[PDB]
Nucleic acid binder design. Structure first.
Lengths: 58, 246, 102, 159
RNA sequence: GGUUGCGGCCAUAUCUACCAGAAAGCACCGUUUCCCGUCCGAUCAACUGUAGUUAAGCUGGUAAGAGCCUGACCGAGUAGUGUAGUGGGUGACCAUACGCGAAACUCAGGUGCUGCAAUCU
RNA sequence: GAAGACAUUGUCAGGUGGGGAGUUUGGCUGGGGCGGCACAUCUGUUAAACGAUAACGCAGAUGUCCUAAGGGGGGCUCAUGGAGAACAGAAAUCUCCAGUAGAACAAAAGGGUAAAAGCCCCCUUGAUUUUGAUUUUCAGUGUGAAUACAAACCAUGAAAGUGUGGCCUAUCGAUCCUUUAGUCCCUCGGAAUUUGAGGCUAGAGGUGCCAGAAAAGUUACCACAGGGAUAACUGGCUUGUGGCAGUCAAGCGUUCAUAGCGACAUUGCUUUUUGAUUCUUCGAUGUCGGCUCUUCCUAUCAUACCGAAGCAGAAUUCGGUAA
RNA sequence: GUGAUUUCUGCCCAGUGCUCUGAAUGUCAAAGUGAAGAAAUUCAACCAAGCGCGGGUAAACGGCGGGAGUAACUAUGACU
RNA sequence: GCCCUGAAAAUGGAUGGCGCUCAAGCGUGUUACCUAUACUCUACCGUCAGGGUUGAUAUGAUGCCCUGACGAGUAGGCAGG
RNA sequence: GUCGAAUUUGGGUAUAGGGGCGAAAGACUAAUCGAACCAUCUAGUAGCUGGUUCCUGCCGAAGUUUCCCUCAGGAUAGCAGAAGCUCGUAUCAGUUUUAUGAGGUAAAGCGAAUGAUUAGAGGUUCCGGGGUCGAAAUGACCUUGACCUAUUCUCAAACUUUAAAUAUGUAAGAAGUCCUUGUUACUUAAUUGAACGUGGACAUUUGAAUGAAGAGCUUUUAGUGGGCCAUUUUUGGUAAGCAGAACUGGCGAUGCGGGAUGAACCGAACGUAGAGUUAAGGUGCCGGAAUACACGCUCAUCAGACACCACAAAAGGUGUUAG
RNA sequence: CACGGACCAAGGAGUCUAACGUCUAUGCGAGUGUUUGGGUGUAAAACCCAUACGCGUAAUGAAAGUGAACGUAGGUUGGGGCCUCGCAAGAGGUGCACAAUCGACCGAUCCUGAUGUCUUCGGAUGGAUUUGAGUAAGAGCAUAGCUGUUGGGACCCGAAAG
C-alpha cells in the first residue's frame, strides 16, 4: 500500500497559532565565544574599576 | 519473457567473454531487443521456449545460478489461457579469471587438501583453482559455491609490474613446467635500490631474463578478510606471479 | 601510500615537551591472551547444553583497515600513536618518488 | 539518491560576476568592524576559507566578536514555530557594512542639531518624519497653453 | 601644469592605426674585479652616470574606428506579472477593473577621475 | 566345555548423526514476485528568482588515490593559430609574434584561479599536543565533514604573513568484547612483596539493511487474526490502441481529381476490443460456453418506395427515408 | 528397485553417494611426555578413528552435447 | 452574430416538471419587488472581564448589585450538577 | 461388480498419540486425523476486528518533522487543554511606508560566449581498449575500432551579457546620542585604541504609519502521526473522479439560504425569541416576487435556456442580419 | 447494493495494589515519620511511649580520597513594595522574589613544585578557551486526592498453536 510521503500543507498555519517571536535579546550578552585574549583582560578591567569606585567614592 | 544476466564485479571478464562467445555460436537469434543495466544486460524474448534455450546454452559456458518468476496480465475467461509474463534471473559466479582467492577452511580440505591461498586458472563451465607454489588443481561446481559464497581477495586492478632476473627450474612439470624458482625484482625498485625477491611460480618455461611480469604484492597490502586473517602468516609468500606482459 | 621511517613530531614525556626525532613502525594487534575477563565469562557460558549463546558476526562489507603508526621517541622512548585514512597498499621506507624519468 | 551537501544548489549564487573575476580590491580589508555594527552578508566565490552557508546569503546581522581574520555575526533564523539565535565566523571578504544603518547615524546627528537649534529660538522642535501627504489646491495656467484634444485610434495590422 | 615614488576607485583608464613631446625626472644605454645567478652578465646580481641617444618605453593628441560608460516625450506604459468577477470562448487562450512594470534596439553625449610625499622654466 | 585381564560395564574426549527436536527464512514497491537502490551519501536538473520542497523522474559519481598530488617561498606562462630551421612529412627539436584561459588543477559534475590555486626548482613534516566554542543534515541529540580562535611546540620566508591535511562541494560507524599507547597513577577490601586480573584517558578490530539481529526452502493437505489500506470477475472515469464517421484527394479508373476504388495527413464520435487506474464489494453479488425466452438499438444483409452510375437488356455496384 | 510371458537391456566410475586384502604423516581432541617458569600457566614434540590421496562400483542416484569438412543431376553425413 | 447541415446506442424520460415563439429563448440597459440561523435595535438565559457594597438594615460578603462584550463543533481536556 | 476363494462374518486376544495400524488414499484410530479425546498450566499472547452505560457549560485539534526489520505500530518536536506564577504599558504584529540588501524564474538575446539532435562510407603496428589461445612473441585470431581525415540547418529544464512581478533580510534611538576622564595582566612608537564605567547635558512629537479583549515566562498531560478537494504554478503519463510536489482557502470537525438533487462550488458560519433591511439566486404556473418597461437578433420535419456541470469539432450554407 | 441489530425484562466493560512524577490541601519545620514492638482498654477501635531505622541537613571522582566567605556572603543592569521632599506630576534613597551577567570558594582533569625530608616522601603558593546532578543566611519529611507512568489477568470478549 503506497503512502503520501510528504507535504507542507497546514505547516505554516500551525506555526502561527503561537505567534513567531524573537529571543528578546537581554542586556549584557554572554561572553561565551568571545576571543579569550579579550576575556582575560576584561576580567581585570571590571575587577579594577570596582576597586576604584569602592575606595575613592564613599 | 526476459533473461536477466548479472555479475557483481566492476570489471567483468567472464561477462565480456560471454558476449564474444554468444556471437560465435550464433545464439541470440530470437531476441526482440537488448536492454542494458548497471550490473549487466537484459535480453527480451518473444516466446517462452526461446528463453530456456539460452539458459541451456549459458549452463555450458559460464557458471550461473538461475531462478524464475512471473506476472499476470489479462486472465481471459473464455478459455483457460495464460498471458503470463516471465522473468529469468541469471547470476554469474563473481570471481574473475585471474584473481587471488582465499578459500574457506572446510571447503579447501575436501577438494584434495589444497592450500587456502590459491589463484584462479581456466574459468570454465566449472570454476578451477590453482595453487601457484606447488602445482595442484581443484574444481568447484556452481552448486557448491552458491550454498556458501565467498569473495575474491584481490582484483585484476592490483597487479604490479615486476622484472625477472633469472629462472631456476626444479624439473617438476605437470603441464606448465612447474616450480621454476624465479628470482624477481620490482620494476619500481630496480632503478635505485638493491632489493631482490625469491619466489616459486608456475610461470616456468615462458619466462626468461629481463621479462616484464605482473604480480600480486602481499608484503604491503592490508587485506581485511577474515579468511586471510585466519591463516599462518609465516607461510604466506611475498609474491604471487600472475601473468607475463607483452 | 608511503610514509618515511623517521618523523620529527611533538613528544610529551615530562622532560621533552618539544619536537624530537621519532621512529615509525606499523601497529600490530597482539595476541588474544585468554584469562581475560570477557573470555572467562564466555567459556563458562558456552559450557553445557544450549549451544551457541553469543552472536556470531557474518555480514562483513569492508575491505580495508585504517593504518595505525606507533611513533617512538629516540630519547625518552615514550611511544605514541597516530592514525591514517583507509588505504589498500601501505609500505614504509622505500620507493622515493622522482617525477622526471623515461 | 538525494543530495544535501554543504554547497548544493549554489551554481549561480557563488559565481563571481561578469568582468569582475580575479583578486579582491584592498578597501575590503582596510575597513574597520567594531562590536555591535550592523553588517550585510554576501559570500565571495573566490575565497573558500571561512565561507558562509547558502542560507545566510543576503541576511543581516550584528557583530559581537572580532578576531584576526574574521568577525562573529549573529543571525536570527526561524525553524518550526520559533526564532533561534545562530552565530557565524566570517572572514572579512564576505562581510560588508549596511548603508541603512549608516544613514540612521547621520540622521541622529541632524536630529540633535535641529533640537539644539530650535531651543535657541524656543518653539516648534518638529522632529518626527511624516509620509507623503495629499497635495494642496493650486491654479494651472492656460497662458500659452491650449488643451490638446485626443481620440482613440482605429485598428491597423502593419504586421 | 609636466615628471617620479606609493596608491585609491578598477576600460570614460583597454585595443588597433599615425603624429608631437622644452625643462627635469624616468627609460634605453657602457663595463664584468667583487657579492651573486645563468647553456648564454639576455633575464636578475653588482659597477660607473662615464661613451652616447628621444629611436622605443612613457605621456599627450587625432579617428563620422572597434569596445566601454552615462542618459533620454527612444523602443514602451508594449512583453511579462500581483489581486477580482456566476466575464467572453466547446476549447486553445483573449478582453476588462485596481496595481507594479522590463530587455534587445534607436538616437544624443562622453573617452579616466583623484589622495599623500618630493622635484621641475 | 569355551573365552580371559582382552571383551563387557562406568566417566570424559574426537568423528559420524533430518532418524528426531527447536527456531529463522529483511525492507521499499502503481497487487505480490524478478530487477533495481530511489535504504548511507555527493554535483547539475526537476524547483515555480531567499531557504525548504516529492515520485521506481532525468544526466551522472562514491566505499578510493597521495611523503607529495600535504605545508612554505621563489622563478616562470598555458590550449591553439601564423611565419621560419639539414635528414624531418600530419605529428620529434629549435625561434619569434599573436593568444582572458578556448589549457591544467588524482576523480563525477558545478564553481574557483594568471607575476596563481597551473608548470619547473629550493627547504621541510602543522597530515603534530591539550581540550572547549561554532556551522551543515538537526529533535537544535548522534555520526561524518567544515570554520574561527586560545595555550604549547615547530616548518618556511629576507620579511609581512601563511599551515591543525588534499582549491571548495562526497570518500564513512555506538553499546558489550578484544587490543595497544598514556600517567606508570588507583584497586584486589586481615597486613605486605612479586606475577596475574580489574579501572580512568586516547586510538584501532564492525556492523553497506550504513542510529548497528546471529538465520535456507516448500505447501495443490492446509490453519488463525484481519484487509476492499491490495490482486483475479461485473460497474465508474480515461481512449494510446480497436471499431466507426467526416474533411483534404496522392496513386488509379486505356486519353478524364470526385461515377466508382481509395493509402497518407487532419477534426471528431462510440464502449461491441486491448491497455491504464484502484472508486465500490474479501463477516462471499455463485466467477466460461451451450440450451430456453422476451424486449431494445441502427452503424441495413433481406423485404417496400425512390435517387446516382463508366445503368441498352439482364446482372450488379453507390446513397437516402425506414427497425 | 522393477512389475506376466516372448524379445531385449547400449555408452560413461568422473560429479554425488557407497565400499576395499591398498599408499603413509598432509589434517589432527582429551589423558600422557618434554622444556621454560617462584607458581597458576605458556610452549613444543608425539598423535586413534575420520577426513585427504589411490582403486572398485550404473537392474546405486543419475548423464548421454558443441566447431569443420570430406559426393553420386537434386543430400543426409560412414569417416575426422 | 443567430440559426441550419456536419451530429449514430441499446427499459420510457427529462432546460427540475408543465410549458413557452414581437418568448416564459439569446445580447444589453434601467427600476420595482420577494428572503438566510447574516447585518441593525430590544427582551431573556449563560459564560468571561472590569467595577461598586461590613456605619448597618440580614436570615446565603463562596451574598446582593452595575456596566460591556461574546456564544458552531467530532477526537480530547476541564467545570458545575 | 464379484459370487468357492488373496471369500464373508461372530466371540476371544494383541499393538495407544509424535504413538499404533496401513495390498499406500495421508487413509483409519468411537459422526473428531497433514497428529484423537479429558483436565490443568490459563483469564495463554495479539502492532489485528467488534463493544465501551447520566445531563448541561467553556475552550478546541491532527494525518507533518527526525529515528527505528518501520510502512495497519511507537518514541520524538508540532498543534490542544488545565493549573497557574511575575507583572500590568510592556513593546510586540501572517500589514504598509521611508531607506538599504540579497536572488537569476517569466520576458528578452543568438549578426555576445557556450549548443545538442536523425544518420554514417573508407583509410590494417598514427592502438588493443573488453576478450580469447599460446614450451612465447618476429603473435596468432576475433572485435569495438583507434581515426571523422570534407563542408551543410536547428535553438535551449540540465545555454548565457541585461533582468522583472509576487514572495524575502535588517534599521527607524533611553539597553540612545553627546561632552569629560576613570579601569586593565589586552593593544599601541605613544594614556593610541578597545571594552565597561563616574560626573554633566538632551523628556513629553523620545525620533514613520495603523492596531494592541493586557505583556512576559513556566509546569504538566490527552488525542493525532491512513487524509481529501478547488483556482493558479507545475513533474511522470495518450489521457483519467490517475500518480507526485508548491503558496493559500476549504471539507474532515458544519449546520443554514441558493446551484431541482450533491462532503468540497456561490452567499454565509449557529444561545432562545419579536421587528426591520439585504446577500447569493430569482419574479408565466407549481413558487414567496413585475404575463414590468426599453432596443435589437433568432423559426429549427431532433430550436434554445445561465458559472463549477453532466459536453461537442474540423469543414460547409444565395437562411437572415449587420459589416 | 459495507458490517451488527426480530421483540422485551435482567445481568453487562479503565478496577485494585506495589513503586512513582507534576499539581493542590493539612500538620509540623532543620528537622520529620506514634502503630515492627511495648504500656493500656469500655477490646481488631481509642489513647500513651523508648531505642534504632528511613528520607533530608554536602557535594565530587572510576577509585585511593578530598570537601564549599578576599568581601556588609561580592560587582553590574532591571525589579513589586517601602522611606523623604513636593500641591500634584515627578525627583532621590532602600530594594526581597526573580531574570540576564562578570567574579569568589569546594571536588575531578591538566600545569606550577615552596619551607621541609627515612632521598623520595611531603604539596605551600599561583594558574588553566576545560568539567560537576555543587556552595553563596537551609526546605524538607509525613498523610490524603484528581491526572499520568511501569509491572501485575490490567477496560471487556476473541485465536492457528505449545
Amino acid at each position: 500500500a503506497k503512502s503520501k510521503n510528504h507535504t507542507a500543507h497546514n505547516q505554516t498555519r500551525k506555526a502561527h497559532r503561537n505567534g513567531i517571536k524573537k529571543p528578546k535579546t537581554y542586556k549584557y550578552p554572554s561572553l561565551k565565544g568571545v576571543d579569550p585574549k579579550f576575556r582575560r583582560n576584561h576580567k581585570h578591567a571590571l575587577h579594577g574599576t570596582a576597586k576604584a569606585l569602592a575606595a575613592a567614592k564613599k | 519473457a526476459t533473461v536477466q544476466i548479472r555479475q557483481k564485479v566492476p570489471h567483468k571478464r567472464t561477462f565480456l567473454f560471454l558476449e564474444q562467445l554468444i556471437l560465435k555460436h550464433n545464439a541470440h537469434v530470437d531476441t526482440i531487443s537488448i536492454s542494458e543495466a548497471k550490473d549487466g544486460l537484459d535480453f527480451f524474448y518473444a516466446q517462452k521456449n526461446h528463453a530456456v534455450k539460452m539458459i541451456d546454452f549459458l549452463n555450458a559456458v559460464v557458471p550461473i545460478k538461475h531462478k524464475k518468476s512471473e506476472e499476470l496480465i489479462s486472465q481471459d475467461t473464455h478459455t483457460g489461457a495464460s498471458t503470463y509474463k516471465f522473468s529469468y534471473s541469471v547470476e554469474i559466479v563473481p570471481i574473475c579469471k585471474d584473481d587471488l582467492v582465499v578459500l574457506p577452511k572446510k571447503l579447501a580440505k575436501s577438494m584434495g587438501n589444497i592450500s587456502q591461498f590459491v589463484l584462479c586458472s581456466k574459468i570454465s563451465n566449472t570454476v578451477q583453482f590453482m595453487d601457484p607454489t606447488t602445482l595442484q588443481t581443484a574444481d568447484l561446481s556452481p552448486s557448491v559455491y552458491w550454498r556458501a559464497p565467498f569473495n575474491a581477495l584481490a582484483d585484476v586492478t592490483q597487479l604490479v609490474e615486476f622484472i625477472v632476473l633469472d629462472v631456476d627450474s626444479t624439473g617438476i612439470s605437470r603441464g606448465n613446467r612447474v616450480l621454476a624458482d624465479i628470482t624477481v625484482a620490482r620494476t619500481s625498485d630496480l632503478g635505485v635500490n638493491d632489493q631482490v625477491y625469491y619466489v616459486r611460480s608456475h610461470l616456468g618455461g615462458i619466462c626468461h631474463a629481463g621479462d616484464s611480469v605482473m604480480g600480486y604484492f602481499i608484503a604491503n597490502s592490508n587485506y581485511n578478510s577474515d579468511l586471510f586473517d585466519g591463516l599462518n602468516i609465516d607461510y604466506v609468500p611475498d609474491v604471487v606471479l600472475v601473468k607475463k606482459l607483452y | 601510500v608511503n610514509v618515511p621511517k623517521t618523523r620529527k613530531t611533538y613528544c610529551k614525556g615530562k622532560t621533552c615537551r618539544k619536537h624530537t626525532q621519532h621512529k615509525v613502525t606499523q601497529y600490530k594487534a597482539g595476541k588474544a591472551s585468554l584469562f581475560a575477563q570477557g573470555k572467562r565469562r564466555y567459556d563458562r557460558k558456552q559450557s553445557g547444553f544450549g549451544g551457541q549463546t553469543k552472536p556470531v558476526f557474518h555480514k562483513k562489507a569492508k575491505t580495508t583497515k585504517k593504518v595505525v603508526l606507533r611513533l617512538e621517541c629516540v630519547k625518552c622512548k615514550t611511544r605514541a600513536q597516530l592514525t591514517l585514512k583507509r588505504c589498500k597498499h601501505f609500505e614504509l621506507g622505500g620507493e622515493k618518488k622522482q617525477k622526471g624519468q623515461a | 539518491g538525494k543530495s544535501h551537501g554543504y554547497r548544493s544548489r549554489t551554481r549561480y549564487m557563488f559565481q563571481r560576476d561578469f568582468r569582475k573575476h580575479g583578486a579582491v580590491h584592498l578597501s575590503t580589508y582596510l575597513k574597520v568592524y567594531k562590536v555591535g555594527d550592523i553588517v550585510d552578508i554576501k559570500a565571495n566565490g573566490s575565497i573558500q576559507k571561512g565561507m558562509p552557508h547558502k542560507f545566510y546569503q543576503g541576511k543581516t546581522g550584528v557583530v559581537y566578536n572580532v578576531t584576526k581574520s574574521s568577525v562573529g555575526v549573529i543571525i536570527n533564523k526561524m525553524v518550526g514555530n520559533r526564532y533561534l539565535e545562530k552565530r557565524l565566523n566570517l572572514r572579512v571578504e564576505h562581510i560588508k557594512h549596511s548603508k541603512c544603518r549608516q544613514e540612521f547615524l547621520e540622521r541622529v546627528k541632524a536630529n540633535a542639531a535641529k533640537r539644539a537649534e530650535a531651543k535657541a529660538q524656543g518653539v516648534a522642535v518638529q522632529l518626527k518624519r511624516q509620509p507623503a501627504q495629499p497635495r494642496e489646491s493650486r491654479i494651472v495656467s492656460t497662458e500659452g497653453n491650449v488643451p490638446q484634444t485626443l481620440a482613440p485610434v482605429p485598428y491597423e495590422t502593419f504586421i
